[PDB]
Design an enzyme around this catalytic site. Structure first.
Site, PDB file in Angstrom:
ATOM      1  CG  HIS A 134      -1.544   0.289  -4.386  1.00  9.85           C
ATOM      2  ND1 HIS A 134      -2.137  -0.694  -5.132  1.00  9.85           N
ATOM      3  CD2 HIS A 134      -2.532   0.886  -3.680  1.00  9.85           C
ATOM      4  CE1 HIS A 134      -3.447  -0.758  -4.848  1.00  9.85           C
ATOM      5  NE2 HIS A 134      -3.704   0.192  -3.916  1.00  9.85           N
ATOM      6  CG  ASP A 166      -7.799  -0.771  -4.700  1.00  6.13           C
ATOM      7  OD1 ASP A 166      -6.528  -0.522  -4.656  1.00  6.13           O
ATOM      8  OD2 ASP A 166      -8.548  -0.938  -3.727  1.00  6.13           O
ATOM      9  CD  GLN A 197      -3.596 -14.638  -4.746  1.00  2.00           C
ATOM     10  OE1 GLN A 197      -3.694 -14.027  -5.792  1.00  2.00           O
ATOM     11  NE2 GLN A 197      -3.588 -13.996  -3.584  1.00  2.00           N
ATOM     12  CG  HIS A 236      -6.820   4.443  -3.939  1.00  2.00           C
ATOM     13  ND1 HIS A 236      -5.622   4.465  -4.637  1.00  2.00           N
ATOM     14  CD2 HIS A 236      -7.034   3.159  -3.588  1.00  2.00           C
ATOM     15  CE1 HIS A 236      -5.121   3.254  -4.670  1.00  2.00           C
ATOM     16  NE2 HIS A 236      -5.948   2.412  -4.018  1.00  2.00           N
ATOM     17  CG  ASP A 237      -4.740   2.443  -0.720  1.00  2.00           C
ATOM     18  OD1 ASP A 237      -5.779   2.298  -0.087  1.00  2.00           O
ATOM     19  OD2 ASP A 237      -4.314   1.536  -1.497  1.00  2.00           O
ATOM     20  CG  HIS A 268      -2.129  -0.964   0.964  1.00  2.00           C
ATOM     21  ND1 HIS A 268      -2.218  -2.170   1.617  1.00  2.00           N
ATOM     22  CD2 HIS A 268      -3.220  -0.882   0.172  1.00  2.00           C
ATOM     23  CE1 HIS A 268      -3.333  -2.759   1.287  1.00  2.00           C
ATOM     24  NE2 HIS A 268      -3.985  -2.002   0.403  1.00  2.00           N
TER      25      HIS A 268
HETATM   26  C1  LIG Z   1      -5.343  -5.636  -1.020  1.00  2.00           C
HETATM   27  N1  LIG Z   1      -6.418  -6.603  -0.713  1.00  2.00           N
HETATM   28  C2  LIG Z   1      -7.163  -6.392   0.539  1.00  2.00           C
HETATM   29  C3  LIG Z   1      -6.743  -7.692  -1.498  1.00  2.00           C
HETATM   30  O1  LIG Z   1      -7.636  -8.446  -1.117  1.00  2.00           O
HETATM   31  C4  LIG Z   1      -6.061  -8.027  -2.784  1.00  2.00           C
HETATM   32  C5  LIG Z   1      -5.820  -7.164  -3.792  1.00  2.00           C
HETATM   33  N2  LIG Z   1      -5.259  -7.807  -4.799  1.00  2.00           N
HETATM   34  N3  LIG Z   1      -5.070  -9.108  -4.479  1.00  2.00           N
HETATM   35  C6  LIG Z   1      -4.437 -10.076  -5.391  1.00  2.00           C
HETATM   36  C7  LIG Z   1      -5.600  -9.286  -3.245  1.00  2.00           C
HETATM   37  C8  LIG Z   1      -5.700 -10.553  -2.487  1.00  2.00           C
HETATM   38  O2  LIG Z   1      -4.807 -11.312  -2.372  1.00  2.00           O
HETATM   39  N4  LIG Z   1      -6.879 -10.942  -1.978  1.00  2.00           N
HETATM   40  C9  LIG Z   1      -7.010 -12.105  -1.234  1.00  2.00           C
HETATM   41  C10 LIG Z   1      -8.274 -12.361  -0.625  1.00  2.00           C
HETATM   42  C11 LIG Z   1      -8.456 -13.449   0.157  1.00  2.00           C
HETATM   43  N5  LIG Z   1      -7.432 -14.339   0.330  1.00  2.00           N
HETATM   44  C12 LIG Z   1      -7.380 -15.511   1.059  1.00  2.00           C
HETATM   45  C13 LIG Z   1      -6.089 -15.986   0.930  1.00  2.00           C
HETATM   46  C14 LIG Z   1      -5.571 -17.201   1.578  1.00  2.00           C
HETATM   47  C15 LIG Z   1      -6.447 -18.126   2.190  1.00  2.00           C
HETATM   48  C16 LIG Z   1      -5.924 -19.250   2.811  1.00  2.00           C
HETATM   49  C17 LIG Z   1      -4.530 -19.450   2.819  1.00  2.00           C
HETATM   50  C18 LIG Z   1      -3.664 -18.525   2.252  1.00  2.00           C
HETATM   51  C19 LIG Z   1      -4.184 -17.399   1.682  1.00  2.00           C
HETATM   52  N6  LIG Z   1      -5.386 -15.129   0.103  1.00  2.00           N
HETATM   53  C20 LIG Z   1      -6.179 -14.125  -0.253  1.00  2.00           C
HETATM   54  C21 LIG Z   1      -5.948 -12.948  -1.035  1.00  2.00           C
HETATM   55 MG   LIG Z   2      -7.365   1.107   0.188  1.00  2.00          MG
HETATM   56 ZN   LIG Z   3      -5.497   0.528  -2.965  1.00  2.00          ZN
END
Ligand SMILES: CN(C)C(=O)c1cnn(C)c1C(=O)Nc1ccn2cc(-c3ccccc3)nc2c1
Ligand SMILES: [Mg+2]
Ligand SMILES: [Zn+2]
Ligand SMILES: [Cl-]
EC number: 3.1.4.17
Length: 313
Positions: free
Chosen positions: A72, A217, A269, A106-107, A68
């Site tokens: 970004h 985002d 993911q 925005h961040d 962040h």
């Molecule tokens: C910035 N932000 C808040 C984002 O969500 C965001 C923005 N871009 N990207 C790519 C993401 C992102 O990675 N999201 C998630 C959402 C749920 N998860 C659950 C797990 C997980 C579960 C079990 C084990 C290991 C990992 N990993 C994720 C990742």
């Molecule tokens: Mg934000």
């Molecule tokens: Zn952001």
């Protein structure tokens, strides 16, 4: 006035594509942002002296955190630049001005922690802003920077044009609260499916701008796989420090923030792509067809995460 920003040929051409990565040279990023404003909005919309001073103050107020961060900000701005530039006729003059600025801001002053953690810690910002905590903070920072002497890039707008842009910026920034995304996309899905979607209805445009903000985002998911994969390392570096911080409050964190469950990231993911990413870009291509290239890159990246699970990488 006649001082146009130019990029080297490779950047000049690739900056126009949705999957452009802004590069590892920090000191080129302000240049890249101005280039985008001048092309997306015009060389008139901002006084350069004021705009350069605003960019450098914005940069100063992003923190040295893994994800962040200033990179970004500029990245999210570039994705919006690409949507604006592929949807030229759909957006007003104030909208093009406000949205590049919303995205850059925005961040602002993010500490690398979720709204959830701010609340469980009992941070003062959680008391001032009970929902969308960090996002209301981002906007508050944006206004404070516009009010610094010589920083008011909107100075020449009328009282009504000025109030309109600040309102576009506020709504835009609040929409980056992913907790608000789910309901927004649902409504847009419903309105698109019943033919009620009306870009002359302001509340409808507000929702479309919200969905755009989410899409910009989350746009690491729309890059070339090596960008997507290496960005994910930075994303997790923040999640996992938050989990460490959760374990210090005597709270077991969610698997996402548990560095012990590092093994399960690939599956986490797939869930994010299916639960958040793919729905987001699907609805956005329904509303704005020329953003299809974000959906396609996102689907390719989902397939790359599936090849990771299957032990093919
Ligand atoms: C910035 N932000 C808040 C984002 O969500 C965001 C923005 N871009 N990207 C790519 C993401 C992102 O990675 N999201 C998630 C959402 C749920 N998860 C659950 C797990 C997980 C579960 C079990 C084990 C290991 C990992 N990993 C994720 C990742
Ligand atoms: Mg934000
Ligand atoms: Zn952001
Ligand atoms: Cl153009």
């Amino acid at each position: 006035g006649l001082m146009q920003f130019t990029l080297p040929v490779r950047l000049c051409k690739e900056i126009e594509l949705f999957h452009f990565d802004i590069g590892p040279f920090e000191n080129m990023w302000p240049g890249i942002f101005v280039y985008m404003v001048h092309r997306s909005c015009g060389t008139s919309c901002f006084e350069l002296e004021k705009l350069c001073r605003f960019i450098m103050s914005v940069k100063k107020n992003y923190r040295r955190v893994p994800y962040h961060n200033w990179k970004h900000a500029v990245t999210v701005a570039h994705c919006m630049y690409a949507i604006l530039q592929n949807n030229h006729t759909l957006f007003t003059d104030l909208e093009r001005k406000g949205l590049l600025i919303a995205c850059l801001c925005h961040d602002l002053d993010h500490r690398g922690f979720s709204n959830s953690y701010l609340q469980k810690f009992d941070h003062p910002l959680a008391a001032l802003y009970s929902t969308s905590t960090m996002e209301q903070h981002h906007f508050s920072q944006t206004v404070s920077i516009l009010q610094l002497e010589g920083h008011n890039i909107f100075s020449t707008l009328s009282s009504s044009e000025y109030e309109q842009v600040l309102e576009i910026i506020r709504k835009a920034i609040i929409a980056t609260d992913l907790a608000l995304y789910f309901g927004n996309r649902k409504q847009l899905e419903e309105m698109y499916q019943t033919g009620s979607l009306n870009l002359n209805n302001q509340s409808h445009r507000d929702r479309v701008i919200g969905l755009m903000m989410t899409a910009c985002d989350l746009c690491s998911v729309t890059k070339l796989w090596p960008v997507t994969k290496l960005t994910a390392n930075d994303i997790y570096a923040e999640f996992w420090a938050e989990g460490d911080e959760m374990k210090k409050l005597g709270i077991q964190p969610i698997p996402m923030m548990d560095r012990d469950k590092k093994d399960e990231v690939p599956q986490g993911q797939l869930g994010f792509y299916n639960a958040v990413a793919i729905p987001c870009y699907t609805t956005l291509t329904q509303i704005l067809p020329p953003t299809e290239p974000l959906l396609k890159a996102c689907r390719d990246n989902l397939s790359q995460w599936e090849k990771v699970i299957r032990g093919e990488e």
